[PDB]
Design a protein around this ligand. Structure first.
Ligand SMILES: COc1cc(F)c(C(=O)c2ccnc(Nc3ccc(C#N)cc3)n2)c(F)c1
Lengths: 401, 536
């Protein structure tokens, strides 16, 4: 049976250009698509389908896997998968000691896609140097990467997980696009054993990564530990505090701009006055707590900003309204683009676990460079929204650790 | 013939109904022409007489050797027809083609008229040969095949042709067939004998499907290229020798040089292009500046010897070499064996108001990388005129992420280098300038000045300025008056932003002058402070 899918009101299907692919990935996509056609998941199509969403190959471990970029289709179908069939997000997920991520994309390929929606899922396998017109397909089944798929499969997913949920009432299982997030408080051993039990239930239905949300603790903006303070050091201090007070209610800076008056040499050493190291230390303590007055709004989009620090470390903030930070963090250790790509995936994963939503990313990189390289290191099954930005380098020196 | 192929189903736009344009009255000779033509077309099955039941119409007419042509004006049916997939999302580049022993072009005769139209759609293609002075009922036909000038015809034809070729392609992997409009280019590595044989089998296969075909021999003119089986080049480029250059002459000259630059190394057009700048009449004469005239000469020299490119050997790496030509102009060549270019190119676009050569080189590299993936499906190995140390210095410190594929230093001056560095720490024993700049929005007046830790103080006044400009001025002030070493405190994120990117070139003269200063210095530390917080 098929569930009726209708796009947004008065809006047409996606017509997104296929970004150039290298030969190895074009090959992988031919291999993969010949098999799926053989298995009836997709069918060739004719010129009378004007639609087109981008497709690419990743690895996710040397098995090529096909990644369809349904970001546009998702925008244009959002009434269907958010309002008519929305999957609710559990607030307790972020509270579990251990959250394991299981790929269940294989499930959708057993459900037929509404015959009248299929045309909107067209994609192209292009050829090198355009020597032969692209190979064109559309889906016959719920495709991976479309937010419509888990919305439709929702009914069958809860049937499958029903036994396991009943037998383990303190496990939270959350579905976001092609993945299941499974959270418990068990000892890591018992937790893993429970995941293995969950696989078996999945395994009977055609469905053949470990987080620790508790440890997730904000990176508090940090104020230099010193005994010796030059004019420069204090200047940088006021700069970093000034900016913090944009976010943190009750950040005071005056007893420090106190010592910063007079046009004194930058290198000149300046004694920390009593009030000064007091106002300073008080700010330290405010900077350790969460922002008073900032709250997630379910109707609003999430934004993520990333800054290249140096030396393989990146800082980020997630907000909905600028300077009203919902979360801040850092990320560890090669290649700039590789690290950015990794950081974006980590941040998206946390974002899904916390709000059941992915952020729109402001990325500090030239468009064509991100575009050229990101799939060489992309491991996830989803793709966040992104845009390309020219980072204020002041913004970034306020987030060092 | 009319291909026995399946038809492609087609629909009007949701909401829309078939066209109903009233047939204008035609002169009797025009009427006579159309009747003869439609009779011949009817006999071959191209069209069908239709009844008065069919309510759709499109205006038909006829144009003048003393042969007549039937023009069906499909403006209305077209805007009411569905959108189709694009025929070509791109055009091959010769540099991407593999060398071939023999190459043949067959043109499909009467392409559109040899493919059937979806029966459910034909009705909307109804047209009407008017009677003399429009007194009686017209003669009404509808199309059975793809109409000339209809929206869906290029796509459905190409798809039909692709569908048809599929067998032959599958039974003939070592043969290359390229579909372009109503031509087929066919290439193989067979000796002429077995080739012309494979070519006949292809024809016979086309014939069984309703497509007739011739045979032209190389070189083939196509998309402004000249294709041989072992080399390629651009269409013959003739640079006018003339005493007076109009805007339109210079436009066409820049167009030809740009096109020629795909294979003629080091073509330049910056100075020619500067002439075009401005509001300017097509017919207006533009005297060539000296640099423009020097440019014309150099290209002139470059274009004398015919140059061809080689084809791609997939068993070998691609080497890409880039050189700075100066003034934000970059040139490159791509070869697999030195120095037999597959193609050349140039890059000159300014991305932003302020940059340096390292940023520009990186952009050039990015443009070439994308282009290689399109043409050859892999990235080239780069040879760049920049030291490894220079490059890793800059991009580790810079806030933007970057990454360029495998590359290595090549000593081909000018070399790319950063022309100053900004200190990482306050400098001891150097004057600290607290600079400040500001503009009254209401009057355009602006003061720009400074106070140092050594009591030096100065304030100039500026006119028709802006806060942005005055803040740059204040920094420029402090650089002029200071010694080879200097600390500078500003509240301008804006000036700070620009200067921290180590620009070496800019659109603002202020910023160029500030760049003058910085290169002259021996040490410069720039510091930012929050404005109005009464810092110094
Ligand atoms: C627009 O003409 C064409 C002709 C073509 F076959 C193609 C190809 O698809 C193609 C594919 C592989 N090698 C060559 N090699 C090749 C083809 C023709 C000549 C010649 N002359 C030399 C080499 N051509 C194409 F993209 C454009």
């Amino acid at each position: 049976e098929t569930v009726p899918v209708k796009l947004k009101p008065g809006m047409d299907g996606p017509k997104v250009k296929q970004w150039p692919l290298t030969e190895e990935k074009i090959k992988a996509l031919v291999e993969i698509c010949t098999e799926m056609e053989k298995e009836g998941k997709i069918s060739k199509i004719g010129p009378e389908n004007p639609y087109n969403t981008p497709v690419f190959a990743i690895k996710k471990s040397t098995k090529w896997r096909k990644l369809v970029d349904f970001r546009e289709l998702n925008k244009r179908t959002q009434d269907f998968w958010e309002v008519q069939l929305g999957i609710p997000h559990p607030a307790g997920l972020k509270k579990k000691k251990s959250v394991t991520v299981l790929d269940v994309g294989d499930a959708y390929f057993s459900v037929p896609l509404d015959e009248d929606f299929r045309k909107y899922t067209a994609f192209t396998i292009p050829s090198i140097n355009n020597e032969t017109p692209g190979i064109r397909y559309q889906y016959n089944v719920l495709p991976q990467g479309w937010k419509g798929s888990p919305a439709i499969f929702q009914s069958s997913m809860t049937k499958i997980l029903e036994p396991f949920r009943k037998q383990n009432p303190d496990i939270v299982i959350y579905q976001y696009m092609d993945d299941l997030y499974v959270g418990s408080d068990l000892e890591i051993g018992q937790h893993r054993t429970k995941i293995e039990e969950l696989r078996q239930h999945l395994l009977r239905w055609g469905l053949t990564y470990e987080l620790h949300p508790d440890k997730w603790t904000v990176q508090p903006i940090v104020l230099p530990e010193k005994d010796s303070w030059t004019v420069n050091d204090i200047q940088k201090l006021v700069g970093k505090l000034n900016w913090a007070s944009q976010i943190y209610p009750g950040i005071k800076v005056r007893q420090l701009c106190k010592l910063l008056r007079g046009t004194k040499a930058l290198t000149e050493v300046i004694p920390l006055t009593e009030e000064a190291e007091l106002e300073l230390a008080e700010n330290r303590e405010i900077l350790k707590e969460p922002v008073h007055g900032v709250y997630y709004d379910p109707s609003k989009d999430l934004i993520a900003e990333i800054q290249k620090q140096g030396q393989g470390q990146w800082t980020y903030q997630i907000y909905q309204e600028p300077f009203k930070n919902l979360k801040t963090g850092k990320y560890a250790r090669t290649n700039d683009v590789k690290q950015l790509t990794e950081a974006v995936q980590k941040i998206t994963t946390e974002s899904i676990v916390i709000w059941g939503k992915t952020p729109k990313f402001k990325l500090p990189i030239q468009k064509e460079t991100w575009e050229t390289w990101w799939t060489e290191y992309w491991q996830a099954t989803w793709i966040p929204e992104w845009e390309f930005v020219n980072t204020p380098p002041l913004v970034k020196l306020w987030y060092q650790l | 013939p009319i291909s026995p192929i399946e038809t492609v189903p087609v629909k009007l736009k949701p909401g829309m109904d078939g066209p109903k344009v009233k047939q204008w009255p035609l002169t009797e000779e025009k009427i006579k022409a159309l009747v003869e033509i439609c009779t011949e077309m009817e006999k071959e099955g191209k069209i069908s007489k239709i009844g008065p039941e069919n309510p759709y119409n499109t205006p038909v007419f006829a144009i003048k050797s003393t042969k007549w042509r039937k023009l069906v004006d499909f403006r209305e049916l077209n805007k009411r027809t569905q959108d189709f997939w694009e025929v070509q999302l791109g055009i091959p580049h010769p540099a991407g083609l593999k060398k071939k022993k023999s190459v043949t072009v067959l043109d499909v005769g009467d392409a559109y008229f040899s493919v059937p139209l979806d029966e459910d759609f034909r009705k909307y293609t109804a047209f009407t040969i008017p009677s003399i002075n429009n007194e009686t009922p017209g003669i009404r036909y509808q199309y059975n095949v793809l109409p000339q000038g209809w929206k869906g015809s290029p796509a459905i034809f190409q798809s039909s042709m692709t569908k048809i070729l599929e067998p032959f392609r599958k039974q003939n992997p070592d043969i290359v067939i390229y579909q372009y409009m109503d031509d087929l280019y066919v290439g193989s590595d067979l000796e002429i004998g077995q080739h012309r044989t494979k070519i006949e089998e292809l024809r016979q296969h086309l014939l069984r499907w309703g497509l007739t075909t011739p045979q032209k021999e190389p070189p083939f003119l196509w998309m402004g290229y000249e294709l041989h089986p072992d080399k390629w080049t651009v269409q013959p480029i003739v640079l006018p020798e003339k005493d007076s250059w109009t805007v339109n002459d210079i436009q066409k000259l820049v167009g030809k040089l740009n096109w020629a630059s795909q294979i003629y190394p080091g073509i330049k057009v910056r100075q020619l292009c500067k002439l075009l700048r401005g509001t300017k009449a097509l017919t207006e004469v533009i005297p060539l500046t000296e640099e423009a005239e020097l440019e014309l000469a150099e290209n002139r020299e470059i274009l004398k010897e015919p140059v061809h490119g080689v084809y791609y050997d997939p068993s070998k790496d691609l080497i890409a070499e880039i050189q700075k030509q100066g003034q934000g102009q970059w040139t490159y060549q791509i070869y697999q064996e030195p120095f037999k270019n597959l193609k050349t190119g140039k890059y000159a676009r300014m991305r932003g108001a302020h940059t340096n050569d390292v940023k520009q080189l990186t952009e050039a590299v990015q443009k070439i990388t994308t282009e290689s993936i399109v043409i050859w499906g892999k990235t080239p190995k780069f040879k760049l005129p920049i030291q490894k140390e220079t490059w890793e210095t800059w991009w580790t410190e810079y806030w933007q992420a970057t990454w360029i594929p495998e590359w290595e230093f090549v000593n081909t001056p000018p070399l790319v280098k950063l022309w100053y560095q900004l200190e990482k720490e306050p400098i001891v024993g150097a004057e600290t300038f607290y600079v400040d700049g500001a503009a009254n929005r209401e009057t355009k007046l602006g003061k720009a000045g400074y106070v140092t830790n050594r009591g030096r103080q100065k304030v100039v006044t500026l006119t028709d300025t802006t806060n942005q400009k005055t803040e740059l001025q204040a920094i420029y002030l402090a650089l002029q008056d200071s010694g080879l070493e200097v600390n500078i405190v500003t509240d301008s994120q804006y000036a700070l932003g620009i200067i921290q990117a180590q620009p070496d070139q800019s659109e603002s003269e202020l910023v160029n002058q500030i760049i003058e200063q910085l290169i002259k210095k021996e040490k410069v530390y720039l510091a930012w402070v929050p404005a109005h917080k009464g810092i110094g």
